[PDB]
Amino acid sequence: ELGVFDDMNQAIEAAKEAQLVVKKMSMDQREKIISAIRKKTIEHAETLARMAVEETGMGNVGHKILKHQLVAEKTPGTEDITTTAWSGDRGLTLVEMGPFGVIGAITPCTNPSETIICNTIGMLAGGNTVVFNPHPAAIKTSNFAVQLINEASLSAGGPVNIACSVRKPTLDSSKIMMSHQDIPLIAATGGPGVVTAVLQSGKRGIGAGAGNPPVLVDETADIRKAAEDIINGCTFDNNLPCIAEKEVVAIDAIANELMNYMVKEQGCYAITKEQQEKLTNLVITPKGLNRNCVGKDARTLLGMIGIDVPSNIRCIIFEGEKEHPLISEELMMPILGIVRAKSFDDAVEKAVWLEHGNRHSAHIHSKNVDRITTYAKAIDTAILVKNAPSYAAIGFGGEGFCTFTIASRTGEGLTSASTFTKRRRCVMSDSLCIR
Amino acid sequence: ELGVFDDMNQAIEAAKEAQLVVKKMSMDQREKIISAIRKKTIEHAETLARMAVEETGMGNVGHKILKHQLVAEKTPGTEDITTTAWSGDRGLTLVEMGPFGVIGAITPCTNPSETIICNTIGMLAGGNTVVFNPHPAAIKTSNFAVQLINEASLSAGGPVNIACSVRKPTLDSSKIMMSHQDIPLIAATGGPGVVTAVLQSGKRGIGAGAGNPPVLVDETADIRKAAEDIINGCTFDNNLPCIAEKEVVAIDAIANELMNYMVKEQGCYAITKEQQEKLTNLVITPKGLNRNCVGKDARTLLGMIGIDVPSNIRCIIFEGEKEHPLISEELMMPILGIVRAKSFDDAVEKAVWLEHGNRHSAHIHSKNVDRITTYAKAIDTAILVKNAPSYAAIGFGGEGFCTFTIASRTGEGLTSASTFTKRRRCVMSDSLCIR
Ligand SMILES: NC(=O)c1ccc[n+]([C@@H]2O[C@H](COP(=O)([O-])OP(=O)(O)OC[C@H]3O[C@@H](n4cnc5c(N)ncnc54)[C@H](O)[C@@H]3O)[C@@H](O)[C@H]2O)c1
Ligand SMILES: NC(=O)c1ccc[n+]([C@@H]2O[C@H](COP(=O)([O-])OP(=O)(O)OC[C@H]3O[C@@H](n4cnc5c(N)ncnc54)[C@H](O)[C@@H]3O)[C@@H](O)[C@H]2O)c1
């Protein structure tokens, strides 16, 4: 398989060779390859989407098609690589974005191919190559994407091996990557474990970690639209996205109206206390999150505990306290608790607790500029969406570019080509200021 | 002593308290404190300069005064914290630079107070506070600077403890910093050891490591001025700066002219083979760089091996091969070998070897745009200065701002306030595009 190797040292050596060419390619040459990658991503979006759902059992095909189309359309390319200039009597000083070299990347089972293609487009734009250690549960989908990238590059005239991977990823192959002297940077997309591992590696690590995004709805919101947006955001790819709404904090005065719209118009099923207990018992196991429930749709999860609901149902909701395990924990399931708040200050406090200091994502429905400001300052997240579904944060119905690697822990935010470059100052003394 | 604590946990707790206030201060409020820090740095520059030379035995007072004046004048303040906006029918998306929190910093014995004051100005501007583990050989100078910063803040109305430190820094206090859960970021300014340690810490590390900066002089250069600039750059603060010229690669045709100007006009003393052997034996010990020679002036180093030279002498020079230990090693001494090159491609090769893949700093004297471009691409350094002394790279006679923390290893380049912030995207959906 193209770009795929039997062991991690081979993969890195191949990437290192390719990068000696990529670093000397024109922007127009990189951009021709990037353009081919975008094209083939759209052309094979259906195949990538169904492969991921088949292999992992998580998410859904239609939404994954939209995610791949988003990656293709809105991931930045070489235009993201920019230059500054300062000039005067003392000359001309430029600051440029140069390559790191061969970048290592550790990718998730939730958005396997999305992360690989997005990372690759950005890293290539800056003159790097990339080697992946994919999630072992999504290895076929991940390596198919690597194969596609290399096909796209060949169709543009090479080189081969701009993106490389391994046939069988292990913690051993990941340790080879994290101690390899030809890898100065690793981008980890996943949970707290992998982020910590990379930040202990002796290399710069970009840490894109976990979240538990609250959405606050106050009494000044468009409540009918808030119901639509929140359920749309929560249930997108069955709640796999790290940015998605995973619990609601609602001001008392509008909480009933909100929940009623959710049930009446947005395909939500309200579960009783008894049902909550049974669902909790299923989805949180003695060994943690039940991997056989992650990324499953609502009707399936309800069926698993013997609740037969019609197929118009796409989300499970209930009112509860913030400490309820289905509200406090990141489930990546279309299960959405509503926490009632007595006042806006109460609601902000509740939301801040629920975000658990991840500083990842949070959302609000409010039309009031002061309310928005207060929440935004307090919650201090890499992402904040106002009056839209969560997916507006990555360019799906919001201004701005797409990424699938949100560096919550290390502070680089929504990563793009510029993230994966080294800054270079060049001082031309006493010449080339033409003023 | 103000801002100084008996142990590292106390220091961090104090910094954490102060940061809850700093993060809510206006830019105008931070800038009033920064302005007071700049003022007191200038007012006490003579004291800081002489304290460092007295305590460490390295460098010289007059040059250290200029370095502190540079820090005060050209370190960026709150103007370095900037915002982007994208807007259209889908609304308004901002990207802001928010604080990390309490930043840890590990600082050198070469530029102790310069690094502390520069780091503090930048970190404060972004809403952070900072805790230092200074170099134990410069602890008095380092903590005097911390004391000055806190005095400056008090004079501006507080808070106290924006910059904190410890009475006695150890590897134990450094380990407390690197495992502390209230520290999400550490800025390490020093050699390969400390950079590696921070990149193993489980936190984001900004790694400002070692160099061995070559200066290439080709046959199109202004050779008389190249001699002046190179010796000025090399001998500044007795070659302590990490950016300073530490060896020359000279095209054959101009090498004699260059060296002759150095001897005749720039206070250089040309040492024989025999003298080279004796100097090597002194300055490189069985245990590595001789700490009793680092940062000493040329006349002193020559005296130490029994060579009496007049006091017009400020640099030791000789012609040699690139592998000569006084040419290949970063000495931080005004000892400057000249390596003769047969052709420009030869000269670039030699310079690239001499830089040792640090990707830190390199310099060139050439008036030819193609020659400059070829060298710049090949040497791939955070800093490149053309036709000036090295110190043009940090705003001393070149366009651009000052820093004392150049993140060669981790890629952030010349660090400033913006470096020490977390990126935050805020998506206001379907409103606040006024076009
Ligand atoms: N911030 C982001 O951009 C982002 C994007 C997608 C997913 N996520 C997060 O990731 C989680 C879901 O994805 P997942 O289950 O694939 O994540 P995961 O953390 O279980 O796995 C991600 C990758 O890290 C590897 N990994 C895990 N632990 C490791 C360790 N100790 N050492 C080395 N490698 C290790 C896995 O093999 C995989 O390749 C959720 O918490 C989600 O919020 C974050
Ligand atoms: N890139 C830059 O901005 C920059 C600036 C100044 C100095 N330097 C480099 O630093 C060196 C000279 O300074 P120095 O002798 O003070 O550097 P050093 O590396 O000996 O010490 C710097 C700091 O790191 C600490 N330290 C050293 N080893 C450590 C370890 N294993 N764990 C934890 N802490 C450790 C020291 O106590 C000190 O506070 C030169 O190589 C120079 O080029 C680089």
Author numbering:
A (entry chain A), B (entry chain A): 28 to 462
The authors write:
To understand the co-factor binding properties of Cphy1178 we determined the structure of an N-terminal truncation, comprising residues 20–462, with bound NAD+ cofactor to 1.6 Å resolution. The structure of Cphy117820–462 was determined with NAD+ bound in the nucleotide binding cleft and active-site pocket after soaking apo-crystals with crystallization solution supplemented with 10 mM NAD+. The ligand displayed excellent electron density and was refined to an occupancy of 0.83 in the final structure using phenix.refine. The adenine ring does not directly participate in any hydrogen bonding interactions, but is positioned between Leucine 198 and Valine 221. Glutamine 357 participates in hydrogen bonding interactions with O2 and O3 of the nicotinamide ribose. The absence of enzymatic activity in the presence of the NADP+ co-factor is explained by the presence of a histidine and proline residue blocking the position that the 2′-phosphate adopts in structures of aldehyde dehydrogenase enzymes determined with NADP+ bound.
Here, we study the kinetics and substrate specificity of an AldDH enzyme from the Clostridium phytofermentans fucose/rhamnose utilisation BMC, Cphy1178. The catalytic and nucleotide binding domains come together to form an extended nucleotide and ligand-binding tunnel that is open at both ends, with the catalytic cysteine (C269) at the centre of the tunnel and the NAD+ cofactor binding at one side. Cphy1178 forms a tetrameric quaternary structure generated by crystal symmetry, with molecules related by D2 symmetry.
